[PDB]
């Protein structure tokens, strides 16, 4: 009822396809090219 | 309107629908279900679109 009345940086796409801190850390290397990008 | 329609009508229906149906989970059964997975997720639009 509350919900009847951003996401852009690598970190809260991370916490969806982790469910765990292992994942979280092996997708920082694609923070070097999504996000910093040379 | 929840005590007149839904308390007493539904009972009704779980009076009479009692013996057909059945209806177990995963988890009654497993506990293997890993989570509540369902989740949700926004995003953008471009302003040429």
Same mark, same amino acid.
């Given at each position: 009822?509350?919900?009847?009345?951003?996401?852009?940086?690598?970190?809260?796409?991370?916490?969806?396809?982790?469910?765990?801190?292992?994942?979280?850390?092996?997708?920082?290397?694609?923070?070097?090219?999504?996000?910093?990008?040379? | 309107? #929840? =005590? =007149? =329609?839904? %308390?007493? $009508?539904?009972?009704?229906?779980? &009076?009479?629908?009692? +013996?057909?149906?059945?209806?177990? %989970? &995963?988890?009654?059964?497993? &506990?293997?279900? +890993?989570?509540?997975? =369902?989740? $949700?997720?926004?995003?953008?639009? #471009?302003?040429?679109?």
């Amino acid at each position: 009822r509350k919900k009847r009345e951003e996401e852009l940086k690598d970190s809260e796409i991370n916490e969806i396809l982790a469910r765990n801190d292992e994942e979280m850390a092996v997708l920082t290397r694609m923070d070097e090219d999504r996000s910093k990008k040379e | 309107l #929840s =005590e =007149e =329609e839904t %308390l007493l $009508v539904i009972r009704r229906l779980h &009076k009479v629908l009692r +013996p057909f149906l059945l209806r177990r %989970l &995963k988890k009654d059964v497993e &506990k293997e279900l +890993p989570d509540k997975v =369902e989740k $949700v997720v926004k995003c953008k639009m #471009s302003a040429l679109q």
